[PDB]
Amino acid sequence: SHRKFSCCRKGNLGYLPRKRCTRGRGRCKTFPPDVQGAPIHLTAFLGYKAGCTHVMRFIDHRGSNLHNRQAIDQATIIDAPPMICTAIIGYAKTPKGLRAVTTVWAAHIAEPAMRRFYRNYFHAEKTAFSTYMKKAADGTYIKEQLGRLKQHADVIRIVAHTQPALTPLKQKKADIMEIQVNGGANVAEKVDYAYALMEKPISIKDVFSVGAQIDTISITRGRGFEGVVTRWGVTRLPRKTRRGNRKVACIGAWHPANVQYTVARAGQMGYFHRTDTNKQVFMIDTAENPRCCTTDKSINPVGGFVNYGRVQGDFIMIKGTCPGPKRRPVVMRNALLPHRNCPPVQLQWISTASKFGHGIFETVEERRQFYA
Amino acid sequence: GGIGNKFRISCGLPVGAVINCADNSGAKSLNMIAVKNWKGHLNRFPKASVGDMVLITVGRDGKPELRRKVTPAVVVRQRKVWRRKDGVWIYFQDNAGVIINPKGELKGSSITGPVAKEAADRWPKISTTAECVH
Amino acid sequence: PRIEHCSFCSKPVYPGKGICFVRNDSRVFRFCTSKCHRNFKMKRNPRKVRWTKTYRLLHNKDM
RNA sequence: CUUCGAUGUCGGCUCUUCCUACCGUCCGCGCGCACCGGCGCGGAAGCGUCGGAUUGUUCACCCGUUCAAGGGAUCGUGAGCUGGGUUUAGACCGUCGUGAGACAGGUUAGUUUUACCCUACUGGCCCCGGGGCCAGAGCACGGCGGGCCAGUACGAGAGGAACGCCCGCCGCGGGCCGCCAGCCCCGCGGUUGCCCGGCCGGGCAGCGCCGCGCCGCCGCGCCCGGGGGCCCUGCGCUGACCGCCUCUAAGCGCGCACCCCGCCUCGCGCCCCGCCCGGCCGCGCGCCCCAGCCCCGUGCCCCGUCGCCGAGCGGCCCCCGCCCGGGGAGACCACCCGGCGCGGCGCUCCUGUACGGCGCAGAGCCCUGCGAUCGCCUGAGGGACGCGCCUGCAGAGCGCGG
RNA sequence: GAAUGGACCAACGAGGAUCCCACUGUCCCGAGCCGCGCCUCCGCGAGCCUCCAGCCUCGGGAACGGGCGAGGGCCGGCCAGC
RNA sequence: GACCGCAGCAGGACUCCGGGGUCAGCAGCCUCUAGCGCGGGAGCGAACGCGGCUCAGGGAAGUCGGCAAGCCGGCUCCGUAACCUCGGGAAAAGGAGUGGCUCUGACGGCGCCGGGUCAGAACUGGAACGGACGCGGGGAUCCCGACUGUUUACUAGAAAC
């Protein structure tokens, strides 16, 4: 017989399997559309979630009540130290999909990249690229291989490496990420632009703009084995249920005679790859600038970013939230399709008070005067 | 009869709540029968926020004419804290409401105590009648 | 920026932080934190809580 | 008919799926379609079909609201639950019976046993570089309103649209923690009884109790969800058969909340590169069109049957550590990191002003003896699992694979 | 329907009903926590079941099959859940 | 602590003697004497379970039904209705106070020495006091049985006897 009372299924089945992510960090999966003859630009950047602050903004959205009004909105700081470009991969679109022609690496790769290539750098034999550095550094090899990319590739990407030494992270190995070069008049314009960046730092200020929307891509916070009520959102049964109230009471009907994939079951909650899309960039700035958040106030919270560190160097504040806990790597891409009706940013205040405890002082100097 | 597109605020008064009278209409306490504009979900008690028109019945405390009838009302004060988009988190000492027709006219001449801006913006008569918008 | 003072604590509350409470008397009492608020609701005099400005002013400590 | 050496027996709760004989939303077309509405029809199962009073009830009925289709899954759903219904033994009442008892009349009280196996499902694992690419599999945004249009078309009035654009909301989905609530592992304060002789500081009352509370979880908070393709049901275009007419028979256009694809979630394999750059194998390329079919209705017909070099192309195989310590990760593993860490020092925050000394405080008693409390030193003391530092001890196997 | 006792409830009741006030995680709508179990390890170690076998969809058949017909899946071995 | 139940089984077994403190208490909580460290230990801090906590706003809307939980509670003083067999109801319902100090009063034997209860007042402490503990939620009615009693050991404590 029927359920008797219409109610939706609890859960999205396009986020199945709900398994711990096998991919090491957030991966981009897809990249923004190439677009012919656009201005040449880099599609993504890798960053590390630092914290959240809350900003006062003047909202110019006509038709909203908050038009010419003031709003306090949550914003997430993601630390983005410059990334060294180390290689240039070209992919030819073929009947079988994009198949890489070749990846040409720089004559000198920095130690953080090499560290990624070995499990323990100290006990490693350190043989990676040993013959390649000799074959390269003559100049001729790179050009002949780059020529192969110009003739037989359509999708040129730059392989970049984050610098973990400029971060409060304990990593010491560079996250290596491919970033697509989009907007070239010809393929040869993209490879030539890439060669200018080879072995050289790329910064968020060049990659993104304030007011633009970005798709954060990251692995989420993990809660381990979790029950159906927490994992899928099923209703706890009445308090008198023998065997407990924290379960789905019927996992199916007599027919079909096997439990279905759509029936909620206990298992891993958290540590799943998720992309958050259409998040507008409130600001891109450097923590070396003493007045970045002053409208002296620099980006460092008084007391420091809880569970993160010092955010030294370049940072980007996106509006809203990003998947993942603090410290976690987040790949950030140009929005695939952006929310057209988003108001332009007018930050009038950024909170710099302690997020460790309930601080009432924006700066350490204010606290020093208060406690005279 | 509400004027404008309200931004969503936390609803602290579910069905069964007995909100107090904020008017001299003669009711002392109003029980919340139901909430207007409500498409619910299974098992979810209808819930209401300040500035939201609700259907109420007046208890034995009220004058006899007011009693025994489902009457329209607007919640003008809620104990539950709610966040205006400006970031202010505001709450009032008591949960109270004004008997009003859906058109907007109010049964009682006077409104007592502070009344939330959410009620006053949505319903103009509430703004004029209430002494304070807080 | 723009600030308000706790009605109980009298310490400045920066934008976006705190709760505001509207009394039946029609007074509005902005509160710094749940501690600034719970002390008031429990009817504990601010002039007897040492951290509160009213005690510091009473002892001559602040003004 | 099949089950009586047993297939647990109604409704509810919880949960998934499925159907269309479609109520609303979508697309057309028809009305006794002015508009608003209603109403009939074809396609359409994506979403929605809710909160309650009485009843064990499905149903019924009524109240309400974003106004509320119908069903299937062993009359879906008991080693899931409930026992309210039903159907044992106690007991009433009415009827019936000489009686024992009966009731397909009412009433009340009445053990709901078992997974550690197999399968399925859900996650987890079976050492083997970094980046990626895509077979297959999953799949997710609907509904409602406000504003401008517009008191406009339309109605000779009452009334009263629309496309578009914009803003919100509901229900859902995926996250998050800046705020604001919850919670607090051993923080700080208060206090009761008993104990450590009193004070200080403790312990016990299985966290004695109460007030706050950090990191972290969390919702009651916050953020995010704007697209393409072929096309039904059809409406049209040119246009016949059928000396006409005609959306159709050739030909063509547009076309649905449906479907397929994208985005998203998983991903066997493969790819490129790095280390390494080594073997092994195969021997063979015009294209179109069939109412021009441009000269056809052949050819190959021997992969050993004598063919096997090289060249060039197309392949194929090879190849790549753990223990240990921490985590932002965890049942175990795995993952992600790694000369950790341990102890200090600052900063920040948490509590709320430490012990002691002092006094021109103190109801007093009385006697320079006691006295709860009080102010001062004292935003003090204590505390920290966050941030910065290391000035101190430390810290990378000659352990096992290779 | 009147000692197969009729009507009547003061006081009593682990009796059967309906309501009201206070009260609350009963619920909306769940969340955080503390123990102990679980889980992993060292040592000990059973029960109950059991023709075999151990993935499905449809068909036909004691009319509802794991084996049979025809399709569609599936290295093999385990763990915690259910 | 060896009995009797499969056993060296949270099952069942009749007595005697019975300190202190808080207290009305042979209650609860803590202890002196005496006894004493229970079919083992380690690690971890998943789900789920069991034993407990706490929860914003609402307050039974949940459910067959308020099941379970919560609320109330000690003492002192006020203040108590309908009904009623005049005995009750009744702790009705409903209030208020309560600590620590510093002192006052009263109450006896009769040179002088008890007693620990009762009042009354200052003065104090984040607006706090039965501070743990122990410890009625109340009310309006309906049925049935007058009551206290008894009952199917091992599913019916009832209106049955």
Report chain E positions within 7 A of protein CB atoms.
25-32, 55-57, 66, 80-82
Q: Which residues of A touch C32 (CB under 8 A)?
A: 360
Distance CA A50, CA A75 (A): 11
Other Cβ atoms less than 10 A from the Cβ of A364: the count is: 12
* φ, ψ at C56 (rounded to 5°): -65, -40
What is the four-CA torsion angle of B107, B108, B110, B114, rounded to 10 degrees? Answer: -60
Adjacent-strand bridge partners of A72: A56
| Any strand D atom closer than 7 Å to A245 CB | no
**A124 in helix, strand or coil?**
coil
Resolution for this model in angstroms, one decimal place? Answer: 3.4
CA angle A268, A336, A19 (to 5 degrees): 10
Distance CA C23, CA B97 (A): 16
Transcribe A93-113 into DSSP letters.
Answer: EETTEEEEEEEEEPSS--HHH
Question: How big is chain C by its Cα radius of gyration, in Å?
Answer: 12
Helix A187-197 and helix A140-152, axial crossing angle in degrees, nearest 10? 150
Distance CA A370, CA A372 (A): 6
Is residue A6 less than 8 Å (CB to CB) from chain B?
A: yes
Q: B84: distance to nearest CA of chain A, Å?
A: 9
Alpha helices for chain A (secondary structure H): 111-117, 130-135, 140-152, 187-197, 204-207, 228-232, 364-370
- Name the one residue in this structure whose structure tokens are 């966040």: B83
Strand intervals (E) in B12-63: 13-14, 18-21, 29-35, 47-48, 53-58
Please judge whether C20 and B90 are an interchain contact, meaning their C-beta atoms are less than 8 angstroms apart: yes
Residue B101 in marked binding region: no
Residue A298 structure tokens = 């620099």
The answer to whether the beta carbons of residues C38 and C9 sit under 8 Å apart is no
Omega of the bond leading into C46 within 30 degrees of 0 (cis): no
Is residue A340 less than 8 Å (CB to CB) from chain C?
A: no
Other Cβ atoms less than 10 A from the Cβ of A258: the count is: 7
Q: Which amino acid is at A72?
A: I
Nearest to A78 by CA among A298, A336, A321, A337: A321
The answer to whether the beta carbons of residues B64 and B108 sit under 8 Å apart is no
Distance CA A226, CA B117 (A): 43
Please judge whether A65 and B42 are an interchain contact, meaning their C-beta atoms are less than 8 angstroms apart: no
Chain C, 4-63: which have a CB under 8 Å from a chain A CB?
11-17, 32-33
Relative to beta strand A67-73, strand A55-60 is antiparallel
Q: Which residues of B touch A69 (CB under 8 A)?
A: 86
